[model samples]
Target: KQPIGPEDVLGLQRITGDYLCSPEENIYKIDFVRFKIRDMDSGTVLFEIKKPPNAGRFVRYQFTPAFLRLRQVGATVEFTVGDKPVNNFRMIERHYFRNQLLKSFDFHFGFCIPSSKNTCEHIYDFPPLSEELISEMIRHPYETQSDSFYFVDDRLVMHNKADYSYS
Candidate 1:
């Protein structure tokens, strides 16, 4: 199998973030390794990516009312790859609620030990995307900000890591 490229992963995050942050009805979440869209009302999934070998797994989800009330959402995505052949890639998704930050989603796309930092593996394991739980995500109460998906001079403060394992 061909090794997954870094550009392809960013493209995935861009498309995925674009859809979910300011979701539209029947929006197609398309990418090289994944294909999916959910119903607006029911949040039912339409398809899948057949679980690609280089797929990344989502580790967190968070929401705050700060941006939801402002009719804006910012999705800042970052990607990092290993210099070795372990096939380990880490990506982070930051959701900005207009001016007040809300949450961020993190991913580990390859083999990773919960306790280790530098070593990784070539296995791909990612959980299914679940949009049904967050019913409020699909409801657009006001017009979404048209500025852009990201900003130029980004500064992240009060770095609070989300822990979904508690739920």
Candidate 2:
């Protein structure tokens, strides 16, 4: 279901955060810390990239609030499946992350876009977290939890709430 009102859009905006990529030995550790997605119209949070459990290659991820310092906004988001280049945003079906995981990693996040007007749904196939990774995350929680989640300002709200929502 798409967001109902301005509040919903604002909620999505709050979830946007920085995308971090670091090299750890042979693995490339990547994380979207406090990453939030909001409707450009209402600024509500549609989804968030909280944290990941397993460490693997550094594939691309999405970050919101493109106007912000950490934001990555453009017409298309890019990644690779083996040697082939995959273009996201252009397809407008499943997200780039979903496509990359399925084609490249042989994994799926399980969610799908039912319609152009509905809010995104998260399919519950992946495990929450391993005991060890949970412990590590507990030791170093998000730095600014308060700032991490909140409503967006009133400055932006051009279109209606159909532009975004969380399910």
Candidate 3:
């Protein structure tokens, strides 16, 4: 992953920021080590690739209010990402989160972390969920945790309980 320019981020932000349903719950956490967006049919597919013309930068050049409206309803749509390793290997230690946020529904935002072993990991290594967070997720499973969030630029935008041992 690379630092995506703000001008680019703002352009797309205008498009998706107005999303009022914005979030609809059912956020998913796939094992990053072996997860791929499988055409929503949840079927056949098992290969992938590397960086785009923008070096490691990404742009959702295809976004539009029209498309955003469609996506808001949960229709099948396309998503994209850049800065893939030429070798495109995988060994991520974090979970691949999913939801309706721009990052979740599309590759329209930008982020990078310290652990980026090639296109393998980001610099801000996402630690595993603590017992508290996991239990919270279990209560609702994937149906009603409807809130949106993305890593815009904050290094440690996660939450911690009163004791601070849950991040």
Candidate 4:
């Protein structure tokens, strides 16, 4: 884990101010640790330098009207992760929305893909969900408890009582 600071949050604000839902050209300064993965049978390291893929920085927004219209009628809203289309809402909530709100919106969205993997993590900022939005989501008949995820920047924040531990 990395220590987050106000500068990271400020940077995100500045970036989002300039380009809403657009990919940024600036590269982020990241702190990462490198380690070796070896094959037990051969006792050999997998590669010389196994660096994670560069983090993606962008501002993303789901047009509220469009999303709500689709959700109300039980229609699939198509979204692109880079070039790939993702139709699954659960997957979107887990990997896309959750990660974006937690890791990117609140701070500098620093993510990296392992060299061996083909698909990199989608990293970007998410629109803030206000109390009104939360209530609206709850009132929707189709929305379930499982869909009630929330976050603040890179932190996993919650709106409901059941999602947290007091003790």
Please name the candidate that would achieve the greatest lDDT relative to the true structure: 1
Q: TM-scores across all candidates? A: 0.26, 0.19, 0.20, 0.18
Stretch of 10 with least lDDT, candidate 3: 158-167
For candidate 4, the TM-score is: 0.18
> Where does candidate 4 stray beyond 4 Å?
1-6, 10-15, 20-117, 121-132, 136-167
Candidate number with greatest TM-score: 1
Q: Put down candidate 1 lDDT per residue, 57-162, tens digits, no spaces.
A: 2324332332122322222222222232323334444443222223334445445223233222212122232343233343532211211121111211111112
lDDT of 4 by residue, 1-167 (tens): 23332333333311122211111311121112332333333444432223351122211221233222221111112111222222111211221122133222221222322232222222233345555554554454322211112222332222111111111
Candidate 3, position 101, lDDT: 22
TM-score ranking, high to low: 1, 3, 2, 4
TM-score of 2: 0.19
- Show where candidate 2 strays beyond 4 Å: 1-117, 143-167
Clashes of each: 0, 17, 7, 4
Could you give me the TM-score of model 1 versus the true structure? 0.26
Q: What C-alpha lDDT does candidate 3 achieve relative to the native structure? A: 0.23
lDDT of each: 0.28, 0.23, 0.23, 0.25
Please give the RMSD to the true structure for each candidate, in Å: 15.7, 19.2, 16.9, 17.8
